[PDB]
Write a protein that binds this ligand. Structure first.
Ligand SMILES: CCCCCCCCCCCCCCCCCC(=O)OC[C@H](COP(=O)([O-])OCC[N+](C)(C)C)OC(=O)CCCCCCCCCCCCCCCCC
Ligand SMILES: CCCCCCCCCCCCCCCCCC(=O)OC[C@H](COP(=O)([O-])OCC[N+](C)(C)C)OC(=O)CCCCCCCCCCCCCCCCC
Ligand SMILES: CCCCCCCCCCCCCCCCCC(=O)OC[C@H](COP(=O)([O-])OCC[N+](C)(C)C)OC(=O)CCCCCCCCCCCCCCCCC
Ligand SMILES: CCCCCCCCCCCCCCCCCC(=O)OC[C@H](COP(=O)([O-])OCC[N+](C)(C)C)OC(=O)CCCCCCCCCCCCCCCCC
Ligand SMILES: CCCCCCCCCCCCCCO[C@@H]1O[C@H](CO)[C@@H](O[C@H]2O[C@H](CO)[C@@H](O)[C@H](O)[C@H]2O)[C@H](O)[C@H]1O
Ligand SMILES: CCCCCCCCCCCCCCO[C@@H]1O[C@H](CO)[C@@H](O[C@H]2O[C@H](CO)[C@@H](O)[C@H](O)[C@H]2O)[C@H](O)[C@H]1O
Ligand SMILES: CCCCCCCCCCCCCCO[C@@H]1O[C@H](CO)[C@@H](O[C@H]2O[C@H](CO)[C@@H](O)[C@H](O)[C@H]2O)[C@H](O)[C@H]1O
Ligand SMILES: CCCCCCCCCCCCCCO[C@@H]1O[C@H](CO)[C@@H](O[C@H]2O[C@H](CO)[C@@H](O)[C@H](O)[C@H]2O)[C@H](O)[C@H]1O
Ligand SMILES: CCCCCCCCCCCCCCO[C@@H]1O[C@H](CO)[C@@H](O[C@H]2O[C@H](CO)[C@@H](O)[C@H](O)[C@H]2O)[C@H](O)[C@H]1O
Ligand SMILES: CN[C@@]1(c2ccccc2Cl)CCCCC1=O
Ligand SMILES: CN[C@@]1(c2ccccc2Cl)CCCCC1=O
Ligand SMILES: CN[C@@]1(c2ccccc2Cl)CCCCC1=O
Ligand SMILES: CN[C@@]1(c2ccccc2Cl)CCCCC1=O
Ligand SMILES: CN[C@@]1(c2ccccc2Cl)CCCCC1=O
Lengths: 311, 311, 311, 311, 311
């Protein structure tokens, strides 16, 4: 239990590898996911070397307390991960192969700008702090980095899991720290949002537009106000599935714009009635006649303009 | 505490058995259930053999630290299960009988396509990793696999609990791994969904169709829009009890279709009024007269077509 | 730490007693409650006997590790209970008095058929597994079974706490198991449901029936549809306080029936208007006149019939 | 580790003191709060006495395992409190000063009758069980009982924290138990309920009363039914912030009464229309004219009568 | 394991430093956030001093049990923090450098008066209790106080993290206590509240004001009551995101005021109809004509007055 000293003054390299067994619980509001994975570590501790011939074994086993093991920690987790050591195997030249299975709740932020058509890059950061008698550095053994074929992140498609090979070394409170960037890349499954949120929301909007083929204020006011309410619901529904971003989300813009198309419609519906009461069904009907086209056209127009600004 | 070595080079076979004591908390959104069960392990460690005559006992007891026990783990769990060792009993020939009682939260995905008339196969996967001095293989002792008669999974009927006898062996990071597939088969209890969701949803739809026996736009608009709102509620209610699937669920299709039957009805209700205002109660009433049949018939028609595509 | 051997071949009897200190968190959806209680155990381990005269003490103390203690476990709990040993007292003849204070979350199912006028029998099952060198059997020391006068289960009245004196012995995976049935009997406090759910729900229904003293379709449709909506709310409110039962609950029937009385009312309201438009205020008014009596009488009739089927 | 024996046969007195550092999470539905406090214990164990002169120290330190410490426990907590021993200090005459810092979730019931103008007395009960070789009794060292000035119970005003000096001694399962009653006295902060619940609820009610200055059934029905719905919302909102009491709460009565004033109003609104249709605007208008006064006066009357029965 | 004694009678100074790694879960209702940080401690324990020349090391390592470490605790946390010791490094003069990584849930109250345009000062209080053989005092090593550049508090902007250098010393139950005030300063990200809550709420209000350009009571009542309902929703939405303050929040005032502008509008809408029925379209229309200006002007007026009182 003290770090393997340098036959010189080289920094000690620890080889890391993560193999995801489960991803689950990608919580958008909290911006967390839960992982369940193999962590693999490898470094040379010459003090542990031995003879295959004399000792008679090709490889020797140790319990974690027996030998020095590098204090590797995750940077962006809620709590210290729950780890369970699975195997420590030393080879004759003093090469250690560490293997734990852990579970942690990771805290990587998401970009909601293109929601629900967004993609994310999840981050799991490995870090290790250098000790007083030598510098420890992390490196990625690509051979030991992966994920099993089952790994299903409910509601998301998993594109890739890779590590940035080059550690970011830097100084944190006196000693030096080595940080590795594992990257889980995912894209949201947009399908459900279509029949659940987007279409219904459009339907109630279209239903509102039939007031342009009506002359009854007593009824138009009921069409336009009733649906505006239904819209409010969908609005609230959506913003309870989402963290409060300081930027504007796509679904948020669309949802907000539609408020305008309701307010303008209530205006037109009111203007039209104001005329009819003053005996002007002529002016009214010419406005009402334009609305029937102006709305769907300015809508299908502005949506195009949003999509542009967003994709 | 080191694996029983081979009188040859055979792999060491561990015999497994799971006996469910409780299933509970089948959470559809998270796609998890909680289990509370006996895990039973059995293998031969010849080093532990003894004489009944001399030693005077037909069977000897050991504490878990005393002997080597195979590191068996669950693949698809949230966290390492909580286990409590109940008994370790060694027989004269060096046969070990291990028995723990554990509880875990298992993570097996569900298929919602036929919801709420769906059936699921829950999976509990046992795995064991081979050590450096021999290969460990899992096997199923059917005699030790079952569930007690109480085991009640609230809201589900339990059909069966069996294991696939043949382990999937494969290589994971250097060493070989042996994985067993225990399978809990359940079918959802569809009853409640009938008076709680399905019928009410139909009733409000039928109530909407009485606008076809009315000439009052001021009222039809109130019938059709008011119920469309009630429908929206049921829609939201249902989609908060369900994970966001990238496929279409039965209840989801039915619920989405009904939106169309609301939008078409608002159209007809509007068309009819447009005629009456132009003085055409003739054309109107002939359309309105067809609707009274076309709707219920196209509905009862399309539902049949869905059920088909789904079952 | 090995079981007291038989001066013969009798099974070892352990005397149990549970004394509830707290019940709390009766969760209807989950069908669990949380308990906080004394567990008391007593058995004879002759090896522990001693002389009062020589040893000078009337009774001797031991720490749990010092002596063999029977592995007693709860059958229907979420996780192994949290226990804290309070006292172990051995008397001269080798009689042990064990006493722990534990807390567990128990998993006993409820019957909702008569909800909210229902009563439940909660179950806490003690179990013990026989060891290889003798059979262990549980028994109830009634003197040590009870609950303190405070024990308040929020929202429920506690009728009784008793144990079934006769253990169910049976064989589970090789060895024999002894199971005791402690029974907590409770009845739901129905009062609040009256002003919170039941009356309001009736009031909105009665408010709907004033359409029978009206000839205005434009208004009846608003009365009947608006209240049907309010009803839907109460329906949803109630079914979020309740697990999804595969049987029909009382409140559920009542709530479902009322849907019918809304659908029929919308029919009558429509029929009446259809006549009036065809110039038939005569036929209309004779129907409308009957409704004013038929409804309240068929309602008060059918409710009686439900109560019957249910109580 | 065995209790200090009596130089006679006196019971051993343990002096207790609680000093709250944090109160937080007063959960009305669960009737729990969370505490974070100093527990202080003091008793005489003569075996521990020593000489200041020879030993050279005015006071000696011990680790909890070194000496016997009385098993003090909380009666009304969810789980055994988390404790962290801060200090054990023995004085020459064998006087022990124990000090832990703990946190627990306490389970004291609340009285909602005057909600939200209610006050509560929270209870923390210390208990200790007598051992076989002498009787232990609790007492309150007032000097060591208090709370820091910060202690802020979000949404409540803290009036006082005191202990009932006289322990309740009694026999529980063979041995004698000593129980102390610490009492945290709080009064609810009623302010927010005013602009959030009470006034809005009144406003929508007043808005409903403008139907008394209207002759339009088509509109009155919309005023009265629409607001009755808004009221239902506030009702539901309030009863989800509150446990289900078997008695009647103030806010509950007020909220329930208002249902009546809606049902009567719908009646009057209907009666008035019934007359007008029979050509009787005379009778109608005389009723409608009374309502304009009868309602506000019978309301402001009945509220006074409730407040009376409740305060 | 006993405190370093004074070469005199000076108090022992412990140097503290906190370096935030994660902030997350700022829960407004509970008034808590979760922290994940380095705690750094440093003090002189001369008993530990040694010779670099003889001993051959520039610095020596110890496990936490080996040496005396000051019992530093957080004042305002839910539970004793989870700590993991990262390093203990002793320098020849007996200077100790302690370093743990901890996570706690902190309990600092927020000021909602200017919500959602508010700023907060979060507090993390370190405390240490003096022992019987000397006084311990805390101090801030500024060099060891900070936060990494990632630290993202979802929905908030982080302005600063600093410590008040001067400890508050005071007496708590016999001994002296030293308390340090670490201060995390944050300002809320108000943006989202604009399109999500504030504008929608204004739009529905404006939509209500179109009743001033209408003469139809049957319709005005529907406009004004329908939107009052939508407003109620937003009100409820907002007050479920917020603790119940005994003071008035900005959003709360605005939301409450708007109720008045609904009640007055319903009055005017009623007054206008009352006149029209008495044949007075003259008086009506002069009132209605003023409203069209009075409302928007008294609104835009009063809002200015609130903003003033609040900022
Ligand atoms: C009428 C409907 C108005 C919709 C509001 C859209 C405003 C918006 O696009 O701003 C978003 C933008 C978001 O930036 P962005 O998404 O437009 O920038 C995209 C550029 N890429 C994606 C390539 C990096 O600005 C903000 O969200 C913050 C300020 C909001 C400005 C208003
Ligand atoms: C009108 C209602 C639209 C629902 C139609 C979906 C029918 C369907 O079977 O889905 C096809 C498929 C087919 O699955 P399947 O259930 O039809 O057939 C397979 C069933 N087994 C495998 C058991 C034999 O499911 C889907 O992926 C749903 C997406 C279909 C695409 C149409 C959705 C358009 C979005 C707007 C709605
Ligand atoms: C109109 C409302 C319809 C109410 C359903 C009536 C169910 C009454 C009944 O006793 O249920 C039978 C039984 C109820 O059991 P039980 O309460 O009648 O049996 C009584 C036995 N003791 C007294 C010991 C408790 O089982 C049911 O709950 C399911 C049957 C419901 C049948 C209704 C099916 C309709 C489907 C959609 C609605
Ligand atoms: C009805 C909606 C109108 C309400 C809008 C209030 C404007 C907020 C003013 C304010 O709080 O900003 C000050 C704060 C600044 O805080 P501060 O500078 O006032 O805090 C200083 C106070 N002491 C000194 C005590 C610390 O935020 C700003 O930077 C300006 C944001 C204003 C953006 C307004 C958008 C309104 C859009 C509504 C349409
Ligand atoms: C058009 C304008 C008006 C529109 C009206 C819209 C109405 C919207 C109302 C919807 C209310 C539904 C509230 C939540 O419903 C369910 O209530 C139950 C009561 O507790 C929840 O119980 C569950 O809790 C977990 C999630 O909270 C689940 O995963 C668990 O399995 C389950 O116990 C269910 O998960 C939860 O989904
Ligand atoms: C015609 C149709 C009628 C339509 C009207 C229906 C309106 C219904 C709206 C009801 C609002 C629902 C949300 C209530 O706000 C609060 O939301 C909080 C979560 O954001 C909840 O938080 C609480 O959770 C525990 C209960 O499970 C409490 O014990 C906790 O103390 C509290 O934090 C509160 O319990 C809960 O009261
Ligand atoms: C025009 C549209 C038609 C219908 C309009 C919408 C009507 C439906 C609105 C219903 C709102 C539901 C009120 C909030 O739900 C309840 O709030 C209570 C207080 O927060 C919940 O209390 C519970 O909290 C957990 C919820 O997950 C449960 O597990 C606990 O057992 C229980 O304490 C109840 O379990 C939970 O059912
Ligand atoms: C006329 C005035 C307007 C009237 C209409 C306004 C009514 C608007 C209806 C509001 C319906 C919202 C119901 C709650 O929906 C969902 O309830 C589920 C039940 O549990 C939630 O489930 C989730 O809860 C966590 C949030 O803390 C997530 O992080 C979890 O991953 C997820 O299980 C979802 O997050 C949550 O989005
Ligand atoms: C005329 C009848 C009235 C018209 C309709 C009445 C209004 C009905 C709309 C009320 C629905 C309000 C939604 C509540 O669900 C939300 O769910 C979110 C998660 O899905 C919550 O998120 C938060 O939950 C904790 C408890 O509030 C917070 O402290 C957490 O920080 C945050 O994650 C939000 O705080 C919580 O407000
Ligand atoms: C698809 N995931 C696998 C798996 C990998 C690691 C742990 C568990 C599993 Cl079930 C399944 C068996 C072949 C190997 C493989 O990749
Ligand atoms: C129905 N479950 C049982 C049970 C099995 C295992 C553990 C507890 C239980 Cl009460 C009940 C007693 C007979 C044996 C049996 O299968
Ligand atoms: C009512 N419960 C008591 C109690 C019993 C056991 C534990 C705590 C408590 Cl206060 C209160 C004191 C008299 C004895 C009794 O039954
Ligand atoms: C107001 N609470 C104090 C406090 C008391 C105990 C623990 C922490 C803290 Cl802050 C603050 C400093 C003066 C003493 C005091 O009462
Ligand atoms: C921005 N935060 C950093 C960081 C600091 C401490 C722990 C983890 C990390 Cl990731 C990232 C790498 C440069 C140093 C730094 O401040």
């Amino acid at each position: 239990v003290s770090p393997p000293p340098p036959i010189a003054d080289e920094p000690l390299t620890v080889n890391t590898g993560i193999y995801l067994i489960e991803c689950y619980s990608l919580d958008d509001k909290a911006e967390t996911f839960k992982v369940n994975a193999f962590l693999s570590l490898s470094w040379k501790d010459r003090r542990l070397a031995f003879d295959p011939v004399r000792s008679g074994v090709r490889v020797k086993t140790y319990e974690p307390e027996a030998i020095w093991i590098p204090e590797i920690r995750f940077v962006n987790v809620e709590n210290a991960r729950d780890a369970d050591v699975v195997d420590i195997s030393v080879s004759p030249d003093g090469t250690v192969q560490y293997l734990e299975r852990f579970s942690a709740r990771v805290l990587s932020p998401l970009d909601f700008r293109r929601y629900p058509f967004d993609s994310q890059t999840l981050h799991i950061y490995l870090i290790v702090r250098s000790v007083d008698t030598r510098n420890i550095v992390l490196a990625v053994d690509l051979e030991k980095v992966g994920k099993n074929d089952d790994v299903f992140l409910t509601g998301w498609d998993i594109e890739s899991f890779t590590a940035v090979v080059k550690p970011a070394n830097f100084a944190l409170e006196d000693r030096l720290e080595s940080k590795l960037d594992y990257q889980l890349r995912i894209s949201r499954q947009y399908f459900s949002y279509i029949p659940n949120i987007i279409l219904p929301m459009l339907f109630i909007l279209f239903i509102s537009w039939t007031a342009f083929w009506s002359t009854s204020y007593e009824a138009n006011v009921t069409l336009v106000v009733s649906t505006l309410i239904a819209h409010i619901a969908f609005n609230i529904l959506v913003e309870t599935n989402l963290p409060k971003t300081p930027y504007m989300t796509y679904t948020g813009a669309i949802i907000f714009m539609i408020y305008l198309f309701y307010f303008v419609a209530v205006i037109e519906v009111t203007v039209q009635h104001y005329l009819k009461v003053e005996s002007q069904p002529a002016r009214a009907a010419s406005i009402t006649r334009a609305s029937r086209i102006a709305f769907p056209v300015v809508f299908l127009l502005a949506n195009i303009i949003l999509a542009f600004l967003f994709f």
